[PDB]
From a paper:
To create monomeric mutants, we designed ΔN-E613K and ΔN-L708R mutations, each of which would introduce a positive charge to the hydrophobic interface. If the ΔN-E613K and ΔN-L708R proteins are monomeric, they are expected to bind next to Ob5 and Ob1, respectively, of the open-spiral pentamer to form inactive hexamers. We solved the cryo-EM structure of ΔN-E613K in complex with MtaLon-Y224S. The structure forms a distinct spiral hexameric complex, in which ΔN-E613K binds next to Ob5 of the pentameric assembly, which is consistent with the predicted binding mode. This heteromeric hexamer distinguishes from the native spiral hexameric form, where the protomer Ac6* binds next to Ob1. The heterocomplex also adopts an auto-inhibited spiral structure; however, unlike the native spiral hexamer, the 3H subdomain of Ob1 rather than Ac6* occupies the axial cavity of the spiral complex. In these structures, the protease domain of ΔN-E613K and the AAA+ domain of Ac6* engage heterotypic interactions with the AAA+ domain of Ob1 and the protease domain of Ob5, respectively. Altogether, these results demonstrate the binding of a monomeric mutant to the pentameric Lon, which results in a 5+1 heteromeric complex. The heteromeric complexes containing the incorporated monomeric ΔN-E613K or ΔN-L708R are expected to be non-functional as they are unable to form a closed-ring structure due to the mutated residues at the binding interface.
Numbering used by the authors:
A (entry chain E): 2 to 73
B (entry chain E): 147 to 291
C (entry chain A), D (entry chain B), G (entry chain D): 219 to 291
E (entry chain B), H (entry chain D): 365 to 436
F (entry chain C): 219 to 509
I (entry chain B): 510 to 582
Write the structure that this text describes.
Amino acid sequence: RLELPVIPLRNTVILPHTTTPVDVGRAKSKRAVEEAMGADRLIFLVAQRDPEVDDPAPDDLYTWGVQAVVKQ
Amino acid sequence: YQLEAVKGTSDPAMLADTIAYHATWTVAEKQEILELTDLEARLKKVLGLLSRDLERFELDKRVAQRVKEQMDTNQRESYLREQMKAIQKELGGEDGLSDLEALRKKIEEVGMPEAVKTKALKELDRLERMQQGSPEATVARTYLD
Amino acid sequence: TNQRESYLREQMKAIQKELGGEDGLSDLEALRKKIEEVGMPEAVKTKALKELDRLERMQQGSPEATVARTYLD
Amino acid sequence: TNQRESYLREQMKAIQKELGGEDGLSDLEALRKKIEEVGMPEAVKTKALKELDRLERMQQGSPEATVARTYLD
Amino acid sequence: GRSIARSMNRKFHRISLGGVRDEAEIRGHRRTYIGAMPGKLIHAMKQVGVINPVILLDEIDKMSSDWRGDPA
Amino acid sequence: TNQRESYLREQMKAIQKELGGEDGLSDLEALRKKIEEVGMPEAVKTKALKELDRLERMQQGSPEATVARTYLDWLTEVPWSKADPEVLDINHTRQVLDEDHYGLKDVKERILEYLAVRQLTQGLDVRNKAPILVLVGPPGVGKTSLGRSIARSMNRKFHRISLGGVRDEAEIRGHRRTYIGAMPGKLIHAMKQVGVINPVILLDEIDKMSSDWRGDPASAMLEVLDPEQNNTFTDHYLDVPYDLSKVFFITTANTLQTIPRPLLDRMEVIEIPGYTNMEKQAIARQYLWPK
Amino acid sequence: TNQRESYLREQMKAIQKELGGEDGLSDLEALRKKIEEVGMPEAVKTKALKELDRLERMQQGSPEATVARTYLD
Amino acid sequence: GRSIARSMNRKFHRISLGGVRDEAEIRGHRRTYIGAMPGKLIHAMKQVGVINPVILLDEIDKMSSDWRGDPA
Amino acid sequence: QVRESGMEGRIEVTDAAILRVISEYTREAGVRGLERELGKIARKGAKFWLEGAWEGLRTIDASDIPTYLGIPR
Ligand SMILES: Nc1ncnc2c1ncn2[C@@H]1O[C@H](COP(=O)(O)OP(=O)(O)O)[C@@H](O)[C@H]1O
């Protein structure tokens, strides 16, 4: 929802109620990963577009963002 | 595991979203799926894309079997045809070279210049084609006529 | 390489001649679909194919050969 | 019909990739690109698919491939 | 005409259509050799590259018209 | 037997590709090398990338690789970022036209005015948006040796390209590098003849170009005459323009009238007569008889 | 290195035996020895060497070599 | 020219240049495949066996100058 | 013609000189001949400044007209 970090999903949105892996290699989204443990394991997983830069701009994000309770 | 991951579903969103993620189509079509905020509209759209990709599968599958059946019929047609070209390796090519032998005997009874004998041998390299009774071999048999 | 080349040469037979994509090499198909479309009397068809034979015994390099092309059209 | 014709386009590019093995994408596939995404009516579009199919014969020893290329231009 | 173009803020063009005698170079010439070419109208149309340009045509009073089609 | 003969045949055609086909790939690799040594601009590097996708041919008869590498030969051979340190002295030209020709002292000063506005350009780049020179006279006048005079007078290089016999625009706008015979007009052949990017290039007998061909090579000249478009000039064979603002073109004719209308623009007229019999003696005794 | 180029040449020639026509192709090898032994200038010789190794094509099936005979002779 | 060949002690090979139209034969023809024939000149200076023959260029006023390349 | 001349700020033709250039050189109802007049003025003045200014403001009055151009036509 609000004040939750955003992980740009790599070229594929995470459809709900699905056991999916979310991989973060860039340090700029690793900052949102480290903030995500401060968000009670509830990440506002807003996916970016098909092209994604190393420093992910929020303008490249989609208008639909999924929220996931982190299993591990 | 995509098939057993979508079995045992209570919620409609437990089924349809899991299936549409585990299915195989484009990522820009995800936006029209979610922008259709009614779950009936999402379910009908995902069903339509599933049917579209399934029909593409039957299309590619029937042309793959068309490729393998034309492979089979060209293989066996060529197999009977190489029984024919094996007789032409054995009996028919000997008869063509017997025509060339008769005209080469006429070469040694009138007497070519040896460069013309060499050219008879050269288009006999264009001839002496045991692999197939080529139209080039027919026209070089006319040449040696 | 030759195995996959044979597979794609079989696939192009399988997918375009069967379905309604294209009629193969459409330079000759254009050169004959310009004949088929019009419905002239067949004497003019024989004249068109005569000019076609004239433009097939040469590779369209004469100055009159392009006049023959555009006149065939 | 559209999901058939998409696959028909996918295999329609396959003959020009065989041409692009020797005579590469440099200008020829660029003309294939100017066939579609440059906006034209469907009569032009079908004529341009026909005109790609007028090509892909052979290019070493013919300006007829070049003249099909330039009318395709 | 250039002033009219920039007043209209659509692109100026000019082609010396003076002395042009040939519809086989204005409606062009159907080709089997390297070198037949479409109209200077067609060429100017490319040179603006826009369906609504401001194209001056030059000196049409002296329109020679003998052979290769009348472009009139 | 078929298995054995196919197995051996493929190996011997493979070695034939090592023998006949591989030399073509190696020579085209060497032409890629001369791209990397010649110092192309990055747009001309993009044309060299088009070359990299064009050098993949067994060349026999109208071959794409041979006329493509011919375009590469032209493009490397039209020079790149050479300086030609042109002496910015009108007086140097003033002494050159005297030392190499007698002259009427009635036509040299128009050349000097032209080179003056070359020396007083609004751009720091030397520009030619003013009308360009045209010479009209007898053929026997030393127009080409005046080209040599303005070569050495401006430290440039003069290259005898007699354009006056050239007729077809297919010669001028050389066509695509898909067929051998896509050969440019004599400007790229003289720009071959220079290894500095700003030479003396002469344009010859535009009255004597009568349009005996489809297409207008006078229009192609107007594409290289207007300095707002010689720098954007391509033919078919060029795709990134060789900029010809540096590549100065002097036009020169003999008859006043049969120059085409699309080339009467941007002209400044210079009319030279013959020589008086005393001046004929002078040119003979100090030049022609010593020659 | 030179004896390696030689041995690959008589395996090239050894496979010219048993294949195609040794008559004609041995004419091409003696021909190309005549081609080498007339005294070429070095640019002439080097740009003849590619044409020489292209004349190594078998004359009938690769008829480029056939006109290469009438070129390098 | 035969007397010149006696005098200069050189070989010659005369050749005929009347009514010849194509640089398939005026110049060599492009070797597209088998049977590309380059014409009279290369055979003519193939018949000589020296790099210094005298070459008899004959009836040159009888040209027919046209396409497939030019005699001049 | 002065921006085209590239000797700006230094050439200053008086208007009476301009009227005299109209009155002496060119008789066209167009203007391009007068532009060529002023171009010749600019060319000869560029030659004159090229060795140095006698004035940093070339007052081109009715006097110096055949000094930057040919005698009144
Ligand atoms: N004042 C002069 N006018 C013309 N030519 C001169 C003069 N002084 C010397 N010459 C020499 O006379 C020759 C003229 O003959 P030519 O070279 O045929 O002229 P072009 O080839 O330039 O038409 C020139 O090469 C030039 O070097």
